[PDB]
Design a protein around this ligand. Structure first.
Ligand code: ATP
Lengths: 118, 830
């Protein structure tokens, strides 16, 4: 979202996030197919400069949106933990939670948090 | 337009129109002054950090006001600007203002034509002057005296004072009113300069403004930093408190309430002297020129070499840009612009001197070494940050032994052991952010065109920071003192010595199930265990016959302890190439150089522990092409950081995946799911080759366009496909412009022909071969063949590894060697 509007600088931020950045434990502890993909990325970037220009964002909503998001994950990690059963793969049922059922309900978290306090 | 001439003196008194940078505020402030008189204390403030150009700004306002006093209906006369730091230490500001006001009145009286008017006005003027003199003792007394009472009751004055007694404010108010009538002006502008030179003198200015300059006929404009004024006002409110009260009420509950009151005392004292609506803030160059594009309503250009017109100027962002880009050997992007934005936030005095030093030294060279030119400017302006941080100040000690010392201490104060070796100016304090570019210039100048000692930055400078962060941990400072001394930081004589030393440091770490496969090394066994299965025997040193004998000779790093243990690491390979390339250009010297690295070098456990004639002809062939390409290498400071960051991450990936693949029998085999003692070290050199190749395409100065593509940055772990595909894509891109490979990756091009690394890339038993993986290897060899000029292994030499003579082009004994802590019990699965 913090990028240019041309076809070049979009890939600069696009390719930057592809590489999984290195990370070490903090000391306080005890121890083709992308040529058309960037176009869709630029398609959304063609919108970020087209809609939010007339927005009026206060500082209360940013915390309110985050607080709704923060609490929502604290329930996903509490209920999907026990649902790693034998046949949880391809969770067509409800109690069968795979590594994607514990994951899909984290991105709808962002979508929901930006609607209740929106 | 606003063009800065770096050969013009650029002084507050030497600035003329079209040279002023704050032309908008000079315009804006003038009318606000006149409007306050055209329509009580009337005080204007111009805020700004030191070096922003406050003194240059404040004279322009006085100069502009005096130009057209007669034209405007309201007439305002301006005193000469008062600099409180240059005044006598005990002279009151009221005396200074009156003495300067007396000069204008005296000079105006000498311009009178009518003798009747001159005699009357002069008599009235000296009447008020004689009453300031009679009351000046009130300004400066150590005590009162009853003799002053008769003066206070001395009401037999012809002139009228509304308030009784000897009031200094009333005497000065009438004197200013008299001076306005003599000068025929509606108001008088008192102007004060900065107090940043000595802010103790600012109290006399602040006290005089509120006590005396309260008249409706006086306008006061002051400059400085509100933080410095705040630090000065707050210190006087503490002096208002009873001294004994400060120790008998030292409780934190009461101390947090005295500070609350003084903060409120400080808050309204500033508000009542300098009203917020009357304040004006001096904007910095980053807020004038802005980022790319307009990003700012003020355009500022600069002159680079003498004999300029106005047309041939250069944008100050570009001038700071090219100086940073060419000086630091950077390329256009975030890194080359993050530095520029950091310099644009520095004070203008510091920014001009960095710019002026660079472009006057540069013009001397043309009658080059641009990094030498810039580092001269940067070093000459950041001394205070350099001194305070703890860096080196001596130009003779511009050696890489000390350059490793400061980096360790730089990140120690930065507390950022993950990205601190990057040298980006993202540090919390401006002092550390100032040292970041200076250290960046050191890497871009000392390591300029030196293929040998740049790895010492990667292996000692930035390498030791990573090793200290994980495997190591005031006693902590004492612990740091033990590490910095024992590890030979600041006492580096050879890269292999640090590589030998670190193998005894990274070894001391808790590993799951205690397998002697540490970060980037395998703990080779100096003993023999019974029931050793398969064609995997003990680590035999005699079996290595030829060039491959010397490959592991440097790699082996014995450790002296109660139980001596040996390690074969990639750092020793990195130590070898640094030291071997640190020699002469003659075959005799390089032969005399090998004995240093192939000899049995040995270190000692740290106290904090509870425990080849044909090869030389090829070696000189490498060096025959090194100096032809080494002089063209311009490595950026973060380029070593970027390369090492992938390197340090790759070793952790390799030491994790390969550790669990040390199975019991038939580890060479065909599958990639089982590994041996030589498979781990095969990818370690491949990781170093990959780490050099990837970021150098992205972040090198001699290569403008990236040559990897818009793919993925996946490091080769257990597979050579990742390293193979990137080189394959490189050739196609270079074909468009018919570009070479020696200058595209000079660091990587000369790391391919190195005979020390040749044995370690293709071990006999450390190789991963398969029917589907052969299509990767057939491209692994079809590309390296063209870039060098021949093939490191012939067809028969290469085909033996895939599927009977012992040859030195590949490892022979390390493949079967055992590793300490690897119990060969569970067989390989399939
Ligand atoms: N308008 C300007 N045009 C060119 N150079 C300027 C300008 N303003 C400031 N500078 C540069 O910045 C330096 C500092 O300016 P100046 O001394 O007026 O500000 P200051 O440091 O706030 O003042 P003081 O000397 O009273 O502490 C100047 O010597 C000059 O090199």
């Amino acid at each position: 979202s913090a990028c240019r509007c041309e076809r070049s600088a979009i890939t600069n931020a696009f390719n930057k996030v592809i590489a999984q950045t290195t990370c070490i434990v903090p000391p306080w502890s005890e121890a083709t197919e992308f040529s058309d993909a960037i176009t869709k990325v630029e398609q959304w970037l063609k919108n970020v400069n087209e809609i939010e220009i007339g927005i009026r964002p206060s500082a209360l909503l940013i915390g309110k949106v985050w607080s709704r998001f923060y609490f929502n994950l604290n329930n996903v990690a509490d209920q999907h933990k026990t649902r790693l059963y034998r046949n949880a793969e391809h969770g067509r049922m409800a109690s069968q939670s795979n590594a994607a059922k514990i994951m899909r309900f984290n991105v709808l978290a962002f979508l929901h948090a930006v609607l209740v306090e929106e | 337009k606003i063009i800065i001439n770096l050969f013009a003196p650029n002084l507050p008194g030497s600035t003329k129109e079209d040279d002023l940078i704050q032309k908008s505020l000079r315009d804006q402030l003038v009318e606000s002054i006149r409007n306050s008189i055209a329509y009580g204390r009337n005080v204007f403030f111009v805020d700004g950090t030191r070096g922003a150009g406050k003194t240059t700004f404040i004279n322009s306002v006085v100069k502009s006001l005096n130009s057209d006093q007669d034209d405007v209906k309201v007439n305002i006369k301006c005193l000469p600007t008062i600099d409180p730091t240059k005044l006598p230490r005990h002279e009151p500001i009221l005396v200074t203002v009156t003495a300067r006001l007396n000069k204008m009145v005296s000079d105006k009286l000498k311009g009178y034509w009518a003798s009747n008017d001159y005699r009357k006005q002069k008599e009235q003027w000296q009447n008020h002057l004689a009453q300031l003199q009679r009351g000046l003792h009130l300004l400066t007394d150590k005590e009162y005296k009853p003799e002053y009472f008769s003066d206070a009751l001395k009401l037999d004055a012809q002139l009228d004072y509304s308030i009784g007694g000897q009031d200094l404010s009333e005497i000065f108010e009438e004197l200013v009113k008299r001076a306005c009538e003599i000068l025929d002006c509606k108001a008088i502008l008192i102007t004060f300069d900065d107090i940043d030179t000595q802010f103790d003198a600012g109290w006399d200015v602040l006290e005089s403004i509120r006590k005396f300059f309260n008249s409706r006929k006086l306008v006061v404009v002051a400059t400085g930093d509100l933080r410095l004024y705040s630090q000065l006002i707050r210190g006087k409110q503490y002096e208002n408190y009873s001294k004994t009260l400060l120790e008998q009420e030292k409780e934190s509950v009461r101390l947090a309430e005295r500070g609350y009151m003084v903060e409120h005392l400080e808050q309204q004292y500033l508000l009542k002297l300098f009203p917020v609506q009357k304040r004006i803030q001096l904007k910095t160059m980053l807020q004038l020129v802005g980022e790319k594009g307009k990003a700012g309503k003020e355009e500022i250009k600069v002159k680079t070499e003498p004999g300029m017109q106005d047309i041939d100027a250069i944008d100050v962002r570009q001038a700071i840009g090219d100086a940073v880009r060419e000086g630091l050997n950077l390329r256009e992007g975030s890194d080359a612009d993050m530095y520029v934005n950091e310099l644009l936030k520095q004070p203008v005095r510091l920014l001009m001197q960095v710019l002026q030093d660079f472009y006057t030294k540069k013009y001397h060279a043309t009658s080059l070494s641009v990094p030498n030119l810039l580092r001269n400017a940067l070093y000459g302006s950041m001394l205070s940050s350099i001194y305070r941080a703890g860096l080196n100040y001596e130009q003779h000690r511009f050696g890489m032994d000390s350059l490793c010392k400061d980096i360790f201490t730089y990140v120690k104060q930065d507390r950022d052991f993950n990205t601190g070796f990057y040298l980006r100016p993202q540090s919390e304090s401006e002092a550390l952010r100032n040292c970041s570019i200076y250290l960046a210039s050191q890497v871009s100048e000392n390591c300029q065109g030196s293929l040998s000692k740049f790895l010492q930055m990667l292996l000692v400078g930035c390498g030791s920071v990573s090793i200290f962060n994980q495997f190591v941990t005031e006693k902590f400072e004492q612990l740091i003192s033990e590490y910095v001394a024992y590890m030979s930081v600041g006492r580096i004589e050879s890269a292999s010595h640090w590589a030998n030393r670190c193998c005894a440091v990274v070894a001391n770490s808790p590993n799951d199930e205690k397998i002697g496969v540490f970060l980037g090394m395998v703990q080779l066994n100096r003993k023999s265990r019974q029931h050793m299965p398969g064609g995997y025997k003990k680590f035999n040193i005699d079996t290595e016959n030829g060039l491959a004998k010397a490959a592991m000779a440097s790699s082996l790093s014995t450790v002296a302890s109660n139980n001596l243990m040996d390690f074969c690491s990639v750092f020793n390979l990195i130590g070898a190439i640094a030291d071997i390339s640190a020699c002469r250009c003659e075959r005799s010297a390089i032969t005399n150089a090998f004995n240093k690295v192939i000899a049995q070098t040995t270190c000692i456990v740290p106290p904090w522990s509870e425990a080849f004639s044909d090869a030389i002809t090829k070696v000189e062939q490498w060096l025959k092409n090194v100096n032809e390409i080494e002089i063209g290498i311009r490595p950026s400071a973060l380029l070593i950081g970027k390369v090492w960051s992938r390197f340090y991450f790759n070793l952790n990936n390799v030491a994790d995946q390969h550790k669990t693949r040390l199975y019991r029998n038939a580890e060479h085999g065909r599958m990639a799911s089982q590994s041996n003692a030589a498979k781990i070290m095969r990818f370690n050199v491949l990781a170093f080759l990959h780490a050099v190749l990837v970021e150098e395409s992205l972040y090198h100065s001699v290569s403008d366009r990236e040559y990897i593509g818009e793919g993925l940055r996946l490091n080769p772990v257990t597979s050579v496909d990742e390293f193979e595909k990137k080189i394959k894509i490189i050739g196609e891109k270079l074909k468009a412009d018919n570009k070479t490979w020696k200058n595209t990756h000079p660091l990587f091009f000369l790391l391919i022909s190195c005979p020390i690394l040749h044995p370690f890339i293709f071990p006999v038993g450390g190789i991963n071969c398969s029917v589907k993986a052969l299509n990767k290897e057939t491209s692994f060899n079809k590309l390296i063949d063209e870039i060098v000029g021949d093939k490191l292994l012939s067809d028969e030499e290469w085909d033996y590894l895939t599927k009977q003579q012992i040859f030195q082009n590949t490892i022979t004994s390390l493949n079967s060697s055992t590793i300490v802590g690897a119990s060969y019990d569970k067989d390989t699965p399939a």
